[PDB]
Design an enzyme around this catalytic site. Structure first.
Site, short mmCIF file in Angstrom:
data_model
loop_
_atom_site.label_atom_id
_atom_site.label_comp_id
_atom_site.label_asym_id
_atom_site.label_seq_id
_atom_site.Cartn_x
_atom_site.Cartn_y
_atom_site.Cartn_z
N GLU A 59 19.67 -20.52 -71.25
CA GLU A 59 18.69 -20.30 -70.18
C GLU A 59 17.21 -20.76 -70.46
O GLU A 59 16.53 -20.78 -69.33
CB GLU A 59 18.61 -18.61 -69.92
CG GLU A 59 20.10 -18.34 -69.15
CD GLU A 59 20.12 -16.93 -68.81
OE1 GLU A 59 19.50 -15.91 -69.67
OE2 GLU A 59 20.52 -16.62 -67.68
N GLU A 96 20.52 -5.48 -77.08
CA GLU A 96 20.66 -6.98 -76.36
C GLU A 96 20.43 -8.06 -77.63
O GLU A 96 21.40 -8.86 -77.62
CB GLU A 96 19.69 -7.28 -75.28
CG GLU A 96 19.88 -8.50 -74.54
CD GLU A 96 18.96 -8.68 -73.27
OE1 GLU A 96 18.20 -7.85 -73.26
OE2 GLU A 96 19.07 -9.90 -72.82
#
Lengths: 659, 659
Positions: free
Chosen positions: B450, B594
């Protein structure tokens, strides 16, 4: 850390940190240990149903100063700065943080609740570079979860000379009772053509931000200011437009003009001051107490402080007898115009007190135990004080008469003091019961000692009823009006009893119980119904043993101090002066909690009491029953070489005391 | 603390504590370090505008288990308990706290998100006293500030046999989109006549409570349960009545029957398991990963997990390709009915994907980057992923085809798989651009990496388009429907490009930039477009050091592990296995964040990836393109003596691997 004008903290410890307040009597801003953040913002006069007690409350408001600073894209945090210090300058209510960011720059920020502009705040940021750097600056308007239905706006106000970028939010208190508007802008020195472009982001439901970048060469100082206005529908019909109008106004006044006006007003406030020689910690502590009362009140208003002033949501922001008896007397002697605002709060709520009297089957005006916007009763229904602690009506009467004694303002007595004194006297005339011996009882109250619930003939309560009736009668005489003769008849026959040990009995069920706070001792000071020094000493020696260390508020030891000061016993006076607040302190700024070892600062009630111990106690100053201020016998602590008290009474008299 | 079934923490440290979750796929309860409290409660399928991203979100819900316990009026605190321990039993999702109150009593409390009753929670409390004592117990229903317009109720449901006291609250999500109801009761063993009287208090705007006293005799254990039901208008038209109905139902089922049903459903989940011999820490870690996936999913629904499942508000509770590519494959092999719920989520949102395609100028179904209640796009507008990261459509097609490959359910392929595959293939047929050379390009996307935004011919995206078109054509063949021949023609000519060193190019602007996460390497696994072992290896060598240590999510190293296992390189496969999650752990329960050194657990996406590294990598298990589960060559970590994987495929096969 014992500067007589500044409270200092090195490397704030977020695990053990009680924030300090800057306030202008309208907005309070409570410090965060985090750089360029504030913990809490409180707006006076704005109440809605919220959390504690199921009754109206102050509402946590926009943390409008919240800023994020990055150097070369690197976010400034507690963990990557060094030499981080916070300082409160009590001379002008400036809260300043300063830190070093690595090898790049020194940052200094100072913020203010502008003293002349009740709804305006300013933070000034100075960046002093050791290397070429680029700053990213963001100001965030996060809607607190206390508010709802927020809207987030941004626009440019321009003309040929200016571009004032406004970051504005509008939102509502929980029930929709109050609409809040906040509007912020950045001020630059460099002018419209050279100032940074301001970006606006709206990325969250509850937060938007305005931001800019600025390249700064090594060895340069770059300064910018954040101005913000915070106002509600409780203050103005159209808070949205008024917030933007105020921020535009402040921007076009500019930093220099705003700080000059701010300083002028703080200079005036400090013309009334307390100077102690030979005790630097006492000097600083007493300054902090004056500073908090000056910050938490405002002349030429109808505002009255809560027990926690604008330091947070303590006691829902409600007004108690903590004003009339604890914070009002020191302010009346030092700045009568502050006392005037406090009693104005009660005058404008006379209709609500008349309504409360009617609902509970009494005559006249029955002031509520806890007051907020309307003047109706706001005590949580789970607390019996709301329905049953009735001395508050006499406390309002006492303050109203004291205001007249100290100012001699007969026009005020006619328009405001007499309406209060007449209605409150009518309440007490309907509240007493005559017994078979022709004495007057007051039955089924909560005592000033609030541990004593639904009991009869509370000493302090009966004392305030006597003074209320007497002062209403003296008031009628001053104004040439006829008082009901029943007021004097009742006042002379209200029961105050002694137990078989020669000690004033707190109530009709009292023998030897622990007591929450001073009650029978208050008949000596402030009510002066007991002037016999032997009875004062008996009541002192007995009741001073009955106050437990735990869960007892700072509404006791300050009176013990003052009375021992009146009896000319330094060691005792000084012992009780220290016990009154030193065991209630929170680090790192020595803010005062309600109780010993408490964690709920700032208890401005407590500061009010201790200021009386200093001014009326050590200073021997006294409201003369015949008018103005007089001075009775006093002593100073051994270790105090000199006590100087300036700006006393409408003559603005200086008093110097020495051993 | 390396029990293969239990995570345990002695004396929780609130300054360094990340709570664990118990959940049933509908309610998640996250632990507090404080005894008898929970930190956060999340209800699946309830979304409203709230904080992050200005888009729909999960909402913090009632902390419905919150309890206060006192012995003879003395409340349980940190300072008066000892031997305080917490434990999560992964066999049945029981979270237990235990402590001694002074030297007087032992207290255990276990709570459960009941596995068979999606909207019901239970906490069981056991108190053993060494002396005669009185307990006071309070259950608090505090309305979180995420909700508004709350109402606080209490009533008795009675018949000749029972008195069920219900503590109920009803409130609304921020915009009023969803009505939430919670209803709690106490269960006692002693029966209607002897059970304690339940008092109700409503002292705050945002909190009410029910309480009782009970005398316990020396050496006796007193047991009681708290049952709560939590449901919204997203789940039922009348949540207020349904919450009370459910709690009454659960009370008259009783603790025994409830825990037996709970245990039966948990036993069934654990019939698919992973057993490691020689590495107790790996065994516990892998059980924790399966536990979280089992807790955060639910068979026989249309629920799909967010990247943080029911551990909190991570990524607003939205559904991403994190399901299809990361959490779905291990669940498809172990429990195909869990995978069926995940793809059902997409099937029932096919309309919303057709609407998105039409709004963005494409044919067929364009699945959103982020999905919530409606299946419309929910990505925060400030993230370019929402408008431009288009591979999610291919990811949905890939999962739908895999579901059919593993189950062979042709009735499901007709009714649900084909509608998805046909619409998604129509999307890609409209999304590609034919160039001069007759190749098909996919221009202006955000990559799986991304960090690469608005670039052309992303390797992963183009690979998903090829697979989507191939699988749709294959599906048409299976069902005897005629597919557009354009789908195969396009699939065979979509550009996947190599750099001069023969390495797969991530996108048309790519040379040697750092990448956020695996992208070109995903063409090897999961897509299997690259099967040549030399190509797999040169792609690993070029890209494996392109992922920075900081701010890179757990969507990379598990794939590196799996590919090195397929290459039979044990040292590299085990290195990347550990690197995938161990640097992401938070104490005291080794929950997964994460990113490396991150503080936002529990990232279920990361657990799903690591489970693929174990099952598909170390176990060599693979979805055969022709149908069913096959096993390819694999290696184990040097230190693993045996890997046993149970319940695999519709034949529920056990696989044992040794050196």
């Amino acid at each position: 850390h014992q500067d007589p004008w500044k409270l200092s903290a090195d490397k704030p410890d977020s695990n053990n940190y009680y924030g300090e307040t800057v306030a202008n009597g309208m907005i309070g801003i409570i410090s965060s240990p985090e750089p360029l953040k504030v913990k809490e913002v409180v707006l006076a006069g704005t109440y809605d149903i919220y959390k504690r007690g199921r009754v109206s409350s102050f509402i946590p408001n926009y943390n409008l100063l919240n800023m994020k600073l990055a150097f070369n894209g690197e976010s400034v945090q507690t963990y990557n700065i060094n030499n981080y210090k916070q300082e409160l300058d009590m001379r002008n209510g400036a809260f300043t943080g300063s830190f070093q960011f690595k090898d790049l720059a020194t940052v200094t920020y100072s913020y203010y609740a502008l003293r002349h502009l009740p709804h305006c705040i300013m933070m000034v940021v100075n960046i002093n570079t050791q290397k070429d750097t680029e700053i990213n600056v963001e100001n965030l308007l996060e809607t607190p979860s206390s508010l709802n239905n927020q809207q987030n706006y941004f626009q440019n106000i321009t003309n040929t000379h200016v571009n004032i970028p406004l970051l504005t939010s509008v939102a509502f208190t929980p029930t929709g009772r109050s609409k809040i508007a906040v509007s912020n802008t950045f001020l630059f020195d460099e002018g419209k053509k050279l100032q940074p472009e301001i970006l606006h982001r709206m990325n969250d439901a509850d937060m938007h931000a305005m931001s800019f970048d600025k390249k700064i060469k090594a060895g340069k100082t770059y300064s910018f200011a954040l101005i913000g206005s915070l106002i509600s529908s409780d203050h103005i019909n159209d808070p949205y437009n008024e917030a933007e109008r105020l921020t535009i106004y402040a921007a076009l006044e500019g930093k220099s003009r705003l700080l000059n006006r701010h300083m002028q007003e703080w200079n005036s406030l400090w013309q009334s001051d307390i100077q102690v020689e030979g005790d630097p910690q006492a000097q600083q502590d007493i300054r902090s107490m004056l500073y908090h009362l000056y910050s938490f009140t405002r002349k030429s208003t109808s505002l009255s402080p809560s027990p926690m002033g604008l330091s947070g949501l303590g006691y829902n922001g409600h007004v108690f007898w903590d004003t009339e008896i604890w914070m009002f007397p020191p302010m009346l002697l030092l700045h009568p115009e502050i006392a005037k605002s406090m009693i104005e709060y009660r005058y404008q709520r006379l209709d609500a007190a008349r309504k409360k009297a009617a609902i509970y089957g009494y005559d006249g005006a029955m002031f509520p135990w806890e007051s907020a916007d309307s003047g109706a009763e706001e005590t949580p229904v789970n607390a019996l004080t709301g329905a049953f602690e009735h001395h508050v009506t006499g406390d309002v009467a006492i303050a109203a008469w004291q205001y007249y004694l100290v100012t001699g303002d007969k026009e005020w007595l006619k328009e405001k003091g007499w309406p209060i004194l007449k209605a409150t006297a009518e309440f007490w005339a309907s509240r007493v019961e005559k017994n078979d011996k022709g004495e007057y009882e007051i039955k089924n109250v909560v005592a000033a000692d609030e541990w004593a619930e639904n009991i009869d003939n509370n000493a302090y309560t009966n004392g305030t009823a006597i003074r209320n009736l007497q002062y209403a009668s003296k008031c009628a005489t001053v104004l040439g009006v006829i008082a009901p003769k029943e007021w004097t008849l009742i006042a002379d026959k209200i029961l105050i009893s002694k137990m078989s040990n020669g000690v004033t009995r707190e109530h009709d069920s009292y023998t030897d119980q622990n007591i929450k706070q001073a009650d029978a001792n208050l008949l000596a000071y402030p009510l002066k119904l007991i002037t016999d020094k032997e009875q004062i000493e008996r009541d002192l020696k007995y009741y001073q043993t009955k106050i437990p260390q735990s869960d007892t508020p700072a509404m006791t030891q300050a009176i013990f101090s003052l009375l021992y000061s009146r009896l000319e016993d330094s060691d005792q006076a000084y012992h009780w002066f220290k016990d009154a607040y030193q065991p209630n302190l929170n680090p790192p700024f020595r803010v005062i909690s309600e109780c010993k070892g408490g964690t709920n600062p700032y208890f401005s009630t407590g500061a009010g009491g201790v200021l009386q111990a200093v001014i009326m106690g050590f200073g021997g100053l006294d409201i003369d029953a015949a008018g103005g201020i007089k001075q009775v016998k006093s002593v100073l602590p051994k270790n105090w070489k000199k006590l100087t008290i300036t700006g006393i009474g409408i003559e603005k008299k200086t008093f110097v005391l020495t051993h």
